[PDB]
Write an enzyme that holds these catalytic residues in place. Structure first.
Site, short mmCIF file in Angstrom:
data_model
loop_
_atom_site.label_atom_id
_atom_site.label_comp_id
_atom_site.label_asym_id
_atom_site.label_seq_id
_atom_site.Cartn_x
_atom_site.Cartn_y
_atom_site.Cartn_z
CG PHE A 129 -2.10 0.96 1.13
CD1 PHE A 129 -3.18 0.66 0.32
CD2 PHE A 129 -2.13 2.14 1.84
CE1 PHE A 129 -4.27 1.52 0.23
CE2 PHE A 129 -3.22 3.01 1.76
CZ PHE A 129 -4.28 2.70 0.96
CG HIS A 140 1.44 5.70 7.55
ND1 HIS A 140 0.76 6.89 7.76
CD2 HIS A 140 0.50 4.73 7.59
CE1 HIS A 140 -0.53 6.65 7.89
NE2 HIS A 140 -0.72 5.34 7.79
CG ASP A 178 -3.96 6.88 8.71
OD1 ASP A 178 -3.55 6.30 7.65
OD2 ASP A 178 -3.76 6.41 9.86
CG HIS A 200 -1.85 6.24 3.39
ND1 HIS A 200 -1.00 5.17 3.33
CD2 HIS A 200 -2.53 6.13 4.56
CE1 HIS A 200 -1.17 4.41 4.40
NE2 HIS A 200 -2.08 4.98 5.17
FE LIG Z 1 -2.63 4.57 7.25
#
Ligand SMILES: [Fe+2]
Ligand SMILES: CC(C)[C@@H](NC(=O)[C@H](CS)NC(=O)CCC[C@H](N)C(=O)O)C(=O)O
Length: 328
Positions: free
Chosen positions: A208, A267, A213, A211
């Site tokens: 992933f 992260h 959050d 980004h």
């Molecule tokens: Fe996250």
């Protein structure tokens, strides 16, 4: 690749009435929030052994038939009212991750925001009780357990910023919180589908991408497999795993209301071929919740940032994350 400094903070004083001890916890939250942006909450009082066992039983027991019946709209055109809540299917040979998301158990057909058809509010969907006995009872109970821990953490964040301890928590209410739990399975696969592995600009193989959050704070339990990295000015750093603690970080609503004094850390998730669980709780406020931004760096706390309603923030943020990092 270096290792991030992620302190372990005993948050148990935040459940008590020793005010000086609470301030000492707040100082540690402040320090972590201004450094890498992550810390582990320890001595939190949640039975994470049962959480992981019950989650594992579900992921391993559910059948394709049941997944279609629980699927969100991205996977089942019939489920137009399930944007957030339900099952997020894997795609054999293409997409490895699969997850189950649920919302406030108090969102029922009788709930006024559901009656008003307010965006981001949905009624949870659950598997059949006879096929998954006790699963819904466990999951709803867990929501309120991690709600309680999150409430306490929000008192620490308030104190850290020089505010009275209910500054955030007053907007975090059982009757209307938009908070969500996601039960994520990252499988072991051999061969692992290459379409499910992303290559970062720096060469790292990812599950992933980078980004921030969409949350006020994020309260995460993960099994004991190292995978997360946090961005610093000197590059990405590994976050060590700990399957007894909760990993905490701020989301972009905190960065907004503090004028980036508490940043939302960027992260990403490394690709690791191991069976593991990732169980985030996204601390969201209510649809109409508004906190006036302030700047803790200024004596008067003055900020020029516009107040942002949490509902509007959440609607824009969830779509933006899908568009940037893909349908999960
Ligand atoms: Fe996250
Ligand atoms: C952590 C986990 N990542 C995630 O949970 C990623 C990035 S924080 N989060 C999302 O996709 C947003 C989920 C929002 C949720 N469906 C809702 O409607 O509230 C991982 O391990 O990939």
């Amino acid at each position: 690749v270096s290792k991030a400094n992620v302190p372990k903070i005993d948050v148990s004083p935040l459940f008590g009435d020793d005010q000086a001890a609470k301030m000492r916890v707040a100082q540690q939250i402040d320090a972590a929030s201004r450094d890498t942006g992550f810390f582990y909450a320890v001595n939190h009082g949640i039975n994470v052994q049962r959480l992981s066992q019950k989650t594992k039983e579900f992921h391993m027991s559910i059948t394709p038939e049941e997944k279609w019946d629980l699927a969100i709209r991205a996977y089942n055109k019939e489920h137009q009212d399930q944007v957030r809540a339900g099952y997020y299917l894997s795609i054999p040979g293409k997409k490895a991750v699969e997850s189950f998301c649920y919302l406030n158990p108090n969102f029922t057909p009788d709930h006024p925001r559901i009656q008003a058809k307010t965006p981001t509010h949905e009624v949870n969907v659950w598997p059949d009780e006879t096929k998954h006995p006790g699963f819904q009872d466990f999951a709803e109970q867990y929501y309120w357990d991690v709600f309680g821990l999150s409430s306490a953490l929000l008192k620490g964040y308030a104190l850290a910023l020089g505010k009275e301890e209910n500054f955030f928590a007053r907007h975090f209410k059982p009757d209307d919180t938009l908070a969500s739990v996601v039960l994520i399975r990252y499988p072991y696969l051999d061969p692992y589908p290459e379409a499910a592995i992303k290559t970062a600009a720096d060469g790292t193989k990812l599950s992933f991408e980078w980004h921030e959050d969409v949350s006020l704070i994020t309260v995460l339990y993960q099994s004991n497999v190292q995978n997360l990295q946090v961005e610093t000015a000197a590059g990405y750093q590994d976050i060590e795993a700990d399957d007894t603690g909760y990993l905490i970080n701020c989301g972009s609503y905190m960065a907004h209301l503090t004028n980036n004094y508490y940043k939302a850390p960027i992260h990403r998730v490394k690709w690791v071929n191991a069976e593991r669980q990732s169980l985030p709780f996204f601390v969201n406020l209510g649809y109409d919740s508004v906190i006036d931004p302030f700047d803790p760096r200024e004596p008067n706390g003055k900020s020029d940032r516009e107040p942002l309603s949490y509902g509007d923030y959440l609607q824009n943020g969830l779509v933006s994350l899908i568009n940037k990092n893909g349908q999960t």
